[PDB]
């Protein structure tokens, strides 16, 4: 957890959100239910598919062969033959398996970013209209219907409208 | 008060990958770069068929052994196959000159 | 009568994956053989319900 969100202050992956990789769960008067985020998800699927396509499709393989038979009296060359194969099977094995872990931890310290990336947009959208619970959620200081909720997820959340009601309940607390 | 949350994926997967720091890191979905299987049967490499020798080897094939009257057949091939222990070769003992050096020559025609 | 881009002493290799571990003896445009027994890389998240 580099960015500190994945297995960080958000300790649980939501088994219920299957539309995407990132989303929100809202709880208000009208009800509850998960909802996944496409701006964050799709930027990640497309980039990762390409990151997979990257390492796959840069191994250019020429039409060649390996199997060579040597007479018993060219053993030094028959030994040389193997050295040329083992050296590649040395290299292409080492370099690959080290690249896997890398673009594994590089792929785990990407999703941790976007989760953290998402948080500091919703947190920088209300900014005092909700007090942060710390486990990866918010408690709105005001009644927020599904039309208000949907603006928080989109990105056009209205701060001035629900600001007057925020100070009257934040004063309560 | 109303609560909105931020959260990510989880599923029934039991795959585990290994990373630079920790191993057996269970992931929701993974992909494998390594090809581990074959089909047990030869195919048309390069598009054109290969030369199947069977009981005879490259020697008797070019020497036309009297028991290889079944495979003086093919007029285009991308590679040659033969059994690991060829049974019908140079029926008469003797030294075939530059033998190994010709299996790479007739390798593809 | 299959067609492939690779051929080993055990059988063909169909996918466009960049590595194989069937057999080092290949012929044609082939995923370069590697000693690995497993090369799984992450494409999702950590499974944390």
């Amino acid at each position: 957890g580099l960015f500190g969100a994945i297995a960080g202050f958000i300790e649980g992956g939501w088994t219920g959100m299957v539309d995407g990789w990132y989303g929100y769960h809202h709880q208000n008067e009208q009800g509850s239910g998960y909802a996944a985020d496409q701006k964050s998800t799709q930027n990640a699927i497309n980039g990762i598919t390409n990151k997979v396509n990257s390492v796959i499709e840069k191994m250019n393989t020429q039409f060649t062969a390996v199997g060579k038979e040597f007479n018993k009296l060219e053993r030094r060359m028959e030994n040389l033959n193997k050295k040329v194969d083992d050296g590649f099977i040395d290299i292409w094995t080492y370099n690959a398996e080290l690249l896997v872990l890398l673009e594994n931890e590089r792929t785990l310290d990407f999703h941790d970013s976007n989760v953290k990336n998402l948080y500091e947009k919703v947190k920088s959208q209300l900014k005092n209209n909700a007090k942060e619970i710390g486990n990866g959620c918010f408690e709105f200081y005001h009644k927020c219907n599904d039309e208000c909720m949907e603006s928080v997820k989109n990105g056009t959340y209205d701060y001035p409208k629900y600001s007057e009601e925020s100070k009257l309940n934040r004063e309560k607390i | 008060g109303d609560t909105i949350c931020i959260g990510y994926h989880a599923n029934n997967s039991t795959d585990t990958v290994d990373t630079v720091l920790e191993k057996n890191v269970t992931v929701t979905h993974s992909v494998n770069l390594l090809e581990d299987s074959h089909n047990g049967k030869l195919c048309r490499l390069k598009g054109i068929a290969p030369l199947q020798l069977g009981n005879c080897s490259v020697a008797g094939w070019i020497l036309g052994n009297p028991e290889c009257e079944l495979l003086i057949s093919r007029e285009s091939w991308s590679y040659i196959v033969e059994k690991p222990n060829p049974e019908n070769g140079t029926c008469y003992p003797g030294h075939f000159a530059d033998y190994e050096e010709l299996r790479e020559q007739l390798s593809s025609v | 009568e299959c067609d492939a881009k690779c051929q080993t002493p055990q059988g063909a290799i169909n996918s466009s994956l960049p590595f194989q571990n069937v057999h080092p003896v290949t012929i044609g445009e082939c995923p370069k053989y590697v000693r690995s027994a497993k090369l799984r890389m992450v494409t999702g998240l950590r499974n944390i319900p």
Epitope: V18, D37, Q38, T41, Q42 | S13, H29 | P49
Partner: antibody, heavy 127, light 111 residues
Framework: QVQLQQSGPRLVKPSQTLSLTCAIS??????????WTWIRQSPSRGLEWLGR?????????DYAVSVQGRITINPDTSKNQISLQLNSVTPDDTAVYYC?????????????????WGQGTAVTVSS | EIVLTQSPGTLSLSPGERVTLSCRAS???????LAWYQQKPGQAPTLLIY???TRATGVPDRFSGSGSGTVFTLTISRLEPEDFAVYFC???????????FGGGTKVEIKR
């Protein structure tokens, strides 16, 4: 393989309750790798999603905003079937009704497609 | 709500002619949640394409998807008699939940 068998051609009096049942064969209904989605189809309004159900250690229910408040999609772990409830049927609801599956794996993300279809149900609401 | 619109509505092409079916979206559908279907008259539709250009299992190679943003396109390289059918593209959103269709495109075989 996976086959979806549905109820026969039904007939419901106005303002009554529609009740269609979808049977799944070859796939556990509580499979964490499959989604159950209902979609109706009229010649006028075309294809329209109605609702979806699924099990991830617990069951969930999501229905399109066009039918919110009068629709439910209940599963049955015993008969290996699912159902559909459409209360207070108007002349608008006279159409066909299908049920879905989804093994559309995108690294765990679901496209929300239909890889398994059902033949259909003639649902006529009299007036 | 994302309502799709396909052009043309009804088309009459001879067999083997390259068939192009555009899918215009009222707003941007993301590269992952587009699915296509081929519905024969009377028969229920079947999966033709999902994702955006990912061939469904058991679908031949003449069909091939393409596009991004609010412009998607269905394409049959060689039209076939068994392609006398109406083709629907299908989108799915995640917030709010929306899964709609378009007007459909009937592929008439020109005689």
């Amino acid at each position: 393989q996976v086959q979806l068998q549905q109820s026969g051609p039904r007939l419901v009096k106005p303002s009554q309750t529609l009740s269609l049942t979808c049977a799944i064969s070859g796939d556990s209904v509580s499979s964490s790798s499959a989604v159950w989605t209902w979609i109706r189809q009229s010649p006028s309004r075309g294809l329209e999603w109605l609702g979806r159900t699924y099990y991830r250690s617990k069951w969930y229910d999501d229905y399109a905003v066009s039918v919110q408040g009068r629709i439910t999609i209940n599963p049955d772990t015993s008969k290996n079937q699912i159902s559909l409830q459409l209360n207070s049927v108007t002349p608008d609801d006279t159409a066909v009704y299908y049920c879905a599956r989804s093994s559309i794996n995108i690294f765990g993300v679901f496209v929300m497609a239909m890889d398994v279809w059902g033949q259909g149900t003639a649902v006529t609401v009299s007036s | 709500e994302i309502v799709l619109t396909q052009s043309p509505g009804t088309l009459s092409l001879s067999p083997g002619e390259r068939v192009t079916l555009s899918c215009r979206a009222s707003q941007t559908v993301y590269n992952s949640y587009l699915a296509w279907y081929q519905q024969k008259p009377g028969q229920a539709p079947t999966l033709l394409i999902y994702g955006t250009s990912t061939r469904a299992t058991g679908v031949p190679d003449r069909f091939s998807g393409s596009g991004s943003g609010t412009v998607f396109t269905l394409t049959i390289s060689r039209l076939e008699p068994e392609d006398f059918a109406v083709y629907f593209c299908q989108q799915y959103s995640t917030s709010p939940r929306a899964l709609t269709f378009g007007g459909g495109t009937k592929v008439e075989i020109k005689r």
